[PDB]
Amino acid sequence: GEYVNIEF
Amino acid sequence: RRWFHPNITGVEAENLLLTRGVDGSFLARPSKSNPGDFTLSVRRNGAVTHIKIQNTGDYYDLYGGEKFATLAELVQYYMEHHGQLKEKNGDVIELKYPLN
């Protein structure tokens, strides 16, 4: 259920 | 393409990627947080992960990243270009199998 934020 | 689900809530994207999906299965759905936006839900490694897509009017990105004109080529670009998605100092995220 994790709203993940990407690292680019 | 059919990886798009306009009818589904965050909870149903969990129930489908769990019962019917395999790791690498993903889908795009309307956002419950931001109306008129969409979130990708990816089943990665046992669990479901949601990623917010940003639509600014002038383009789609994943809140940073390369900018795309439509939702559909955004998913296309990330299915084809393996490896550009790293969770913040966590694993990679692969958008492999379109769901249903």
Q: Rounded CA gap, B91 and B49, in Å? A: 12
* The total number of residues written for chain B in this structure: 100
Contact state of A6 with B48 under an 8 Å Cβ cutoff = no
Q: SS3 of B80, please? A: helix
Element (H, E) at B97: strand B97-98
Q: Provide the number of CB pairs (under 8 Å) joining chain A to chain B.
A: 44
Q: Give the closest residue to B76 by CA, choosing from B63, B50, B95.
A: B95
Residue tagged 């600014």 (tokens): B56
CATH number of the domain at B1-100, out of 3.30.505.10, 3.40.640.10, 3.40.50.720, 1.20.140.10?
Answer: 3.30.505.10
Contact state of B47 with A7 under an 8 Å Cβ cutoff = no
Q: Which of residues 1-8 of A touch B (CB under 8 A)?
A: 1-8
Contact state of B50 with A8 under an 8 Å Cβ cutoff = no
Contact call for residues B22 and B97 (beta carbons, < 8 A): yes
| Domain ranges (residues) in chain B | 1-100
Strands B25-30 and B97-98: parallel
Residue tagged 């199998």 (tokens): B97
Residue B29 per-residue DSSP state: E
Technique employed here was: X-ray
Q: What distance, in Å, lies between the first and last C-alpha atoms of chain B?
A: 10
Q: SS3 of A8, please? A: coil
Structure tokens at B84: 């550009």
Q: Which of A1, A4, A8 sits opposite B51 (nearest CB)?
A: A4
